[PDB]
Amino acid sequence: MEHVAFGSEDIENTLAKMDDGQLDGLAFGAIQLDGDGNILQYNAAEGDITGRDPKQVIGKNFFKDVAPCTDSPEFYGKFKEGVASGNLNTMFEYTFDYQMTPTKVKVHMKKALSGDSYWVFVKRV
Ligand SMILES: *C(=O)/C=C/c1ccc(O)cc1
Numbered sequence: 208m209e210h211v212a213f214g215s216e217d218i219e220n221t222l223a224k225m226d227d228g229q230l231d232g233l234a235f236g237a238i239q240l241d242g243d244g245n246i247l248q249y250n251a252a253e254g255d256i257t258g259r260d261p262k263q264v265i266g267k268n269f270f271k272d273v274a275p276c277t278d279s280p281e282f283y284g285k286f287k288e289g290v291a292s293g294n295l296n297t298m299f300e301y302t303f304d305y306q307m308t309p310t311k312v313k314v315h316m317k318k319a320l321s322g323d324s325y326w327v328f329v330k331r332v
Pocket of ligand 1: 257259273274277302303304305
């Protein structure tokens with residue numbers, strides 16, 4: 208395992224050192240998005256939660272293509288305000304229900320330490 212707790216205050220500094228292989232050792236799902244919502248990184252734990260194959264969703268748009276259930280003011284709306292503002296740090300519960308059994312999760316969205324990238328972290332509840 209990589210030992211990093213979900214919700215940790217300095218998580219963006221810790222994850223700045225990991226490559227795709229290290230990200231697969233986290234105890235929670237991790238997605239890195241660009242400012243348009245395209246998927247740059249997608250770890251093994253997220254694929255275990257949602258059924259998606261990580262290598263197949265990199266490059267797709269999360270809000271348009273992969274996760275239309277998140278295209279709502281409650282999820283995408285928060286993301287886009289964060290990108291526009293250049294700051295984002297929010298945690299909320301959500302249900303993922305597209306082409307899968309409805310699954311309740313906790314989501315943490317946080318701006319990355321690098322400029323135009325954003326993390327989405329997911330764990331079951
Ligand atoms: C709603 O459409 C949610 C879909 C979804 C969430 C998270 C993922 O990693 C993949 C699909």
